[PDB]
Design a protein around this nucleic acid. Structure first.
Ligand SMILES: [Mg+2]
Ligand SMILES: [Mg+2]
Ligand SMILES: [Mg+2]
Ligand SMILES: [Mg+2]
Ligand SMILES: [Mg+2]
Ligand SMILES: [Mg+2]
Ligand SMILES: [Mg+2]
Ligand SMILES: [Mg+2]
Ligand SMILES: [Mg+2]
Ligand SMILES: [Mg+2]
Ligand SMILES: [Mg+2]
Ligand SMILES: [Mg+2]
Ligand SMILES: [Mg+2]
Ligand SMILES: [Mg+2]
Ligand SMILES: [Mg+2]
Ligand SMILES: [Mg+2]
Ligand SMILES: [Mg+2]
Ligand SMILES: [Mg+2]
Ligand SMILES: [Mg+2]
Ligand SMILES: [Mg+2]
Ligand SMILES: [Mg+2]
Ligand SMILES: [Mg+2]
Ligand SMILES: [Mg+2]
Ligand SMILES: [Mg+2]
Ligand SMILES: [Mg+2]
Ligand SMILES: [Mg+2]
Ligand SMILES: [Mg+2]
Ligand SMILES: [Mg+2]
Ligand SMILES: [Mg+2]
Ligand SMILES: [Mg+2]
Ligand SMILES: [Mg+2]
Ligand SMILES: [Mg+2]
Ligand SMILES: [Mg+2]
Ligand SMILES: [Mg+2]
Ligand SMILES: [Mg+2]
Ligand SMILES: [Mg+2]
Ligand SMILES: [Mg+2]
Ligand SMILES: [Mg+2]
Ligand SMILES: [Mg+2]
Ligand SMILES: [Mg+2]
Ligand SMILES: [Zn+2]
Lengths: 141, 130, 184, 37
RNA sequence: GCUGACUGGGGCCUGUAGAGCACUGAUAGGGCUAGGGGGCCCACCAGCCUACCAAACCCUGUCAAACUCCGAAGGGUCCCAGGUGGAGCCUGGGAGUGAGGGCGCGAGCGAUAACGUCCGCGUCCGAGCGCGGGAACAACCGAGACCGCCAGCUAAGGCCCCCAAGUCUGGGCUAAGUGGUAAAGGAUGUGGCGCGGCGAAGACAGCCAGGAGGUUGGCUUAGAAGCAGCCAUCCUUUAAAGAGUGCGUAAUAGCUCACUGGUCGAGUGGCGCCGCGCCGAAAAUGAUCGGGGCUUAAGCCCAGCGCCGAAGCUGCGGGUCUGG
RNA sequence: UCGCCUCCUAAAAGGUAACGGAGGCGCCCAAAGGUCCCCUCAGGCGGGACGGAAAUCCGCCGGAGAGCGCAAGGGUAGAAG
RNA sequence: UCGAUGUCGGCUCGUCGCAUCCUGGGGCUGAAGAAGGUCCCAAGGGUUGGGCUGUUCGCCCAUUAAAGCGGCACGCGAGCU
């Protein structure tokens, strides 16, 4: 999958999901990008499932830029166990994405391709998405 | 009207040497007969007697922006203008007169011509060959 | 590129937009006024104007002063403009972003790879009067390996730069085909 | 391809109709025939 | 005996929200560059190349309860002021209580499941299962019931009948009974904004004609002729016709659409939004939004006048507890 | 699991729970105490006999990242080292 | 609900759901026909007898148009066992 190589703490509280995006709202790298429209924990297996979908659509071509990173520990208690006895074990890792974050984005591929490519990856994600392309993203001078 | 602008501009410039500007019939041909008709007074008149077709609309505006109305007898419908800036006007016609009678079409298909300014006629085309 | 502006006294910015306008501001050494522009109209300009070309504003005083966007703040969600910063041009030397027009088919593409345009601009200081349009760039020749950058561009008359200039501006990276899964 | 939740066109000769209050996909080639359910 | 809660003005104490990487760690790509596969290798003296691995470091993008260069709102406390309250403070007598619960918000746990669980502030129930609304219903909305009245104004919620009061007045929306409660996801459902593109030098649809020569473009174990992956990525005679839009041959053939001629001779296709609706939608005794029923509404949205409506508030009479 | 210490959870005073998250203590020092006087680190880059990539040296550059008996935090070179 | 709500399986007796096993309608089929597959509509009525195990369940035997899956305090002990 995709996950941190080291850590200071193996497990962490759940935290909340209010707010916009904090950052990562403009294209920055490629020509097109997939933006999140709802709050959600995107799991490593979801990210992978999307990325492969990408590389799979446009076989041998362009560059894909995964911009979200699963570094937050997802926990789960053993099958059929009661409440108590301490915190559960790490089942996987997630990426906390809030409305507006540009999760993925492609480069070096025909427009038509960028579309169907990003559309598919959307389906793999557990939230509503929107495709876009460089615009007022030139945050400069 | 951005591409049609160049179209008319070109028709006019070409409509300059008005010596054999004629318009007749023998249509409904294939693409194989394309290079055919396009060989009449081109193998005796050279790059002087050619056959170019364009929008009737844009064509009827050309004749206005440079006197040559009277094309009322012949105007409506799908038409072609066998422009001949050089090479015998009556000779470049003695061609379009045969190929037509050859491609299987009665001696009835000639919609007037303008020889160096002069409204020809219908039957006045069956003679421009003989 | 003509874009009209209007003055703002000091009434709820939330209203301006809940209307159809886009609040903003004008400034440089001297002068700094709260202004605004029609949203749907400012967008049509910026789409091409961007921050690479000078946006000539106006006002009631019929004073068409030249400027260029210093920064546009977005809405994060809804992702649309929410405020603009207009920099009024003078005669003084100013630093701006001039678009890099990478022209040519890099040998690395036909071969194997994608032209990742690391930097589609480059802040450079210059004279308002003398503002370039686009700094062309020689891309052909770049193979799969590393790629040209920063200190490798034809800097027009009176236009140096505020870069490293080691800052890589482009690089050809091999393409991604098949064969995946490394964690067996 | 008959009764699904996602009814689209599949091919240039497929036309999206709507009768009996439902969305049907009508087309020359019988397979593409769809509904919604 | 004015010091109370609460409040105004000062002074600081602080590190949450947020944000941000300067610290501690986590981070994707790129550059540069110790190494190490290894590579041309003139062979020890270095060396050169590398769409692999890859430090440190810089650039672009980010991440944190146990990160913080930074940092609110607020909160705490002291001082000066308001504040006469079943306020406070001091001493003593009598206790009961030490199973709490729901709701909101901030965290943990949980699986951001539970009429779950554990803390934090608040609030109600508890003890207000007294009253009005919510069909019914401890804790949702309204409101703190001393007693009496065949008087009055209101609250929430209502004003077609059940059922007290508008079948009220203007502008819209919906056509499903949506309203009367589910998602991703679909769709020429309706209505309204946009912004571009084409069109009376004739667009859009339909119809009529053409839709060609380079040649079956090169490349494939069978073959691949416009229709499996690439280079060059173009030419020709042209009104206009691709090294081709689907259908289709084993492959050709065939039928098509890209484009334009021409009739016709007024608008017409593209996408981005917003409102309300359609499908998506299967569970167990008999059904229904509480019922009847309701469609320019008796639904939804937005203005307005007016009424109904509690044990709340007035009016009238009475009792009682404090203080003066 | 049961007492004690550090950090978080703890909602920027204090306090605050759960079989919540993550680590320590049940010692030690006669110098690791008192006072007086001096001294300033870690690393980075050079240059260096054996010298790993830190032995000890030399030269710049370096406000603290070193050190402070042991956990963690706070603190600290204008010293607590 | 612990000042008591008898607990598995069978028997008996039904009744309901539909996410349909058969039967009836129908679309697509890689549907020639016949026989299938799949999806949509549809419970009106049907949905066998045995061997083994307390069994539910399953595995077999022999048939069948079919030998459906679930609910009713895992229906039914003031009805039986
Ligand atoms: Mg006082
Ligand atoms: Mg006080
Ligand atoms: Mg105060
Ligand atoms: Mg913090
Ligand atoms: Mg935060
Ligand atoms: Mg204060
Ligand atoms: Mg009291
Ligand atoms: Mg007492
Ligand atoms: Mg207790
Ligand atoms: Mg309890
Ligand atoms: Mg308790
Ligand atoms: Mg309480
Ligand atoms: Mg409690
Ligand atoms: Mg409480
Ligand atoms: Mg909870
Ligand atoms: Mg509870
Ligand atoms: Mg709860
Ligand atoms: Mg407790
Ligand atoms: Mg109370
Ligand atoms: Mg009550
Ligand atoms: Mg009761
Ligand atoms: Mg009540
Ligand atoms: Mg009630
Ligand atoms: Mg009272
Ligand atoms: Mg009244
Ligand atoms: Mg009211
Ligand atoms: Mg009434
Ligand atoms: Mg719905
Ligand atoms: Mg939806
Ligand atoms: Mg109305
Ligand atoms: Mg009263
Ligand atoms: Mg009294
Ligand atoms: Mg605290
Ligand atoms: Mg606090
Ligand atoms: Mg000493
Ligand atoms: Mg009893
Ligand atoms: Mg059914
Ligand atoms: Mg059959
Ligand atoms: Mg049954
Ligand atoms: Mg019984
Ligand atoms: Zn079809």
């Amino acid at each position: 999958m995709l996950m941190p190589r080291r850590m200071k703490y193996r497990k962490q509280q759940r935290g909340r999901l209010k707010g916009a995006t904090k950052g990562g709202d403009y294209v920055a790298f490629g020509d097109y990008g997939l933006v999140a429209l709802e709050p959600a924990w995107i799991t490593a297996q979801q990210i992978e499932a999307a990325r492969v979908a990408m590389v799979r659509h446009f076989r041998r071509g362009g560059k894909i830029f995964i911009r979200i990173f699963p570094d937050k520990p997802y926990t789960k208690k053993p099958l059929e166990v009661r409440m108590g006895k301490g915190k559960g074990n790490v089942e996987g890792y997630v990426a906390v994405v809030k409305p507006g974050r540009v999760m993925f984005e492609v480069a070096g591929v025909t427009e038509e391709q960028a579309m169907e490519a990003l559309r598919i990856a959307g389906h793999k994600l557990p939230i509503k998405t929107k495709i876009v392309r460089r615009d007022a993203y030139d945050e400069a001078q | 009207x951005x591409x049609x602008x160049x179209x008319x501009x070109x028709x006019x410039x070409x409509x300059x040497x008005x010596x054999x500007x004629x318009x007749x019939x023998x249509x409904x041909x294939x693409x194989x007969x394309x290079x055919x008709x396009x060989x009449x007074x081109x193998x005796x008149x050279x790059x002087x007697x050619x056959x170019x077709x364009x929008x009737x609309x844009x064509x009827x505006x050309x004749x206005x922006x440079x006197x040559x109305x009277x094309x009322x007898x012949x105007x409506x419908x799908x038409x072609x203008x066998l422009x001949x800036x050089x090479x015998x006007x009556x000779x470049x016609x003695x061609x379009x007169x045969x190929x037509x009678x050859x491609x299987x079409x009665x001696x009835x298909x000639x919609x007037x011509x303008x020889x160096x300014x002069x409204x020809x006629x219908x039957x006045x085309x069956x003679x421009x060959x003989x | 590129y003509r874009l009209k502006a209007y003055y703002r006294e000091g009434e709820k910015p939330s209203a301006l937009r809940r209307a159809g306008k886009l609040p903003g501001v004008m400034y440089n050494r001297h002068l700094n006024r709260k202004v605004y522009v029609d949203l749907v109209e400012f967008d049509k300009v910026f789409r091409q104007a961007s921050i690479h070309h000078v946006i000539v504003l106006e006002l009631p005083d019929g004073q068409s002063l030249p400027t260029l966007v210093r920064q546009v703040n977005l809405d994060k969600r809804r992702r649309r403009p929410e405020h603009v910063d207009f920099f009024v041009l003078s005669d003084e030397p100013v630093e701006m972003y001039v678009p890099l027009r990478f022209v040519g088919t890099p040998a690395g593409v036909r071969a194997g790879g994608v032209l990742q345009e690391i930097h589609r601009d480059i802040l450079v200081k210059v004279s308002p009067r003398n503002i370039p349009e686009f700094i062309e760039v020689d891309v052909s020749g770049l193979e799969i390996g590393d790629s040209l950058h920063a200190s490798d561009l034809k800097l027009p008359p009176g236009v140096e730069l505020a870069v490293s200039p080691e800052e890589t501006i482009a690089a050809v990276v091999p393409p991604e085909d098949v064969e995946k899964l490394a964690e067996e | 391809m008959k009764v699904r939740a996602s009814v689209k066109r599949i091919c240039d000769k497929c036309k999206v109709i709507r009768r009996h209050g439902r969305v049907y996909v009508i087309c020359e080639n019988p397979k593409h025939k769809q509904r919604q359910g």
